Subunit: 185 residues, 3 copies
């Protein structure tokens, strides 16, 4: 019989008050606290903390504080990852990001969600849907990436865009709900 | 013969530079500073601080740092209140929230506003309009709730929604300005 | 024969990893760290730190922590400047703001941008376009102001608005992409 963690990772309904999940969120918040307190010149300390926090990385990555996440271990980024100030990644399920990603400030990436149904939501059970972002993606500042979304290679998300569905490779999308506004290839 | 505080709470034009109001904002920011500095495992200290800061609460509530507000005492939340990372509540007038509220990260709830007219606005005088949120409401991350809005029981605010008008009970709204996208239950 | 800083300020492609630019960014973050750590009652220290950080100011200005910026010296504000909690100003190029500005919380002002082509963007070279904001402007909470935008005197930006083009004087804009929704006269 599946644990709440197994249920969470599998995209099934789970209880976030589970003791194992609580311990793991406290661990993520501890590492995030240490991260957000580092000085602007402590690059090596920052790299080390991020490689410890995330599930996987490439050689190089840089994130401006403040940063926020749920678990840490569900975040997998490619080479030369960059995220500007005040980002939030709710990584209840996997968040997999490709190489040479540029993410602007105040960007929120969500895998966490609730049942829409009033009665179901009030159970207090939640679930997640993974987010996949390809290579050479630019996510404009203040964008919102919703659970279950896949963004294709070379795509561009306009600043302030609320992305509610998959974004094709080589597309620029913007607005809310975001839609294709330009093709690059 | 009304004080600036009395005019503020009544929804009339008032001067925020008023000494009494300045002191109360200083007090809110002090409690918010103490709150934001608490460690991820300091649940009891957090509960205590929020109960001191807010006008009223139910038995249990939890907010992820960072949190910001203006006064504290104008915020009234129901049972099992949860607000995720980096929320802002500008509580110049009352913000009343029902039970079992789930609020995502980076959500802003405003009761503070200015005159549209330039001379009127440069008077420097401001005003407020209260916000009322019902029971079993889910406010998606990065939503904006404007002054004067009432959100009905069971409603869902999509991530990134900018809510400019009342939301019926059992409706799902999304967009900017938010509109009804479906009905529930 | 131009330095990366000279290309940056002139709106040309530049490399942010330039040693001079890195030094200058570290200075800005240092001063921003000192600013964000100030207590709610340290008004004089706050005023001094902002006049050090910014390119130019009027007599009086106040920003609620947290604040973020890239360089500081490209930010020029007019008399009686106010910015609420959790603002971000990416001042790769000049951000010039007039007198009596009220900026709500969580507002993002960008001058930094990337090429749309992924090979061109993957060069890692970036560029900037200045933002100009007139006098007596109200920027609603959670607005996003994109590079190259000019906002006219007495304009009002609705909360949550994503401003992708110039805003006429005496106009109210709202939405994403923002459009004029009311003329003030």
């Amino acid at each position: 019989m599946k644990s709440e963690k197994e249920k969470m990772l599998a995209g099934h309904l789970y209880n976030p008050a589970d003791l194992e999940l609580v311990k793991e969120r406290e661990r993520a918040r501890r590492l995030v606290r240490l991260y957000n307190e580092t000085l602007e010149t402590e690059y090596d300390k920052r790299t080390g903390l991020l490689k410890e926090l995330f599930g996987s990385t490439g050689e190089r990555l840089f994130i401006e504080p403040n940063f926020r996440c749920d678990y840490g271990y569900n975040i997998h980024v490619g080479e030369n990852f960059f995220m500007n100030f005040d980002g939030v990644i709710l990584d209840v399920c996997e968040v997999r990001i490709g190489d040479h990603c540029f993410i602007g400030p105040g960007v929120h990436i969500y895998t966490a969600t609730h049942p829409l149904d009033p009665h179901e939501r009030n159970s207090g059970l939640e679930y997640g849907k993974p987010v996949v972002i390809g290579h050479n993606v630019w996510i404009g500042g203040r964008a919102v990436i919703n659970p279950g979304v896949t963004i294709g290679d070379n795509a561009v998300i306009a600043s302030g865009a609320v992305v509610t569905k998959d974004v094709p490779a080589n597309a620029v999308v913007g607005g809310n709900p975001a839609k294709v506004i330009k093709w690059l290839k």
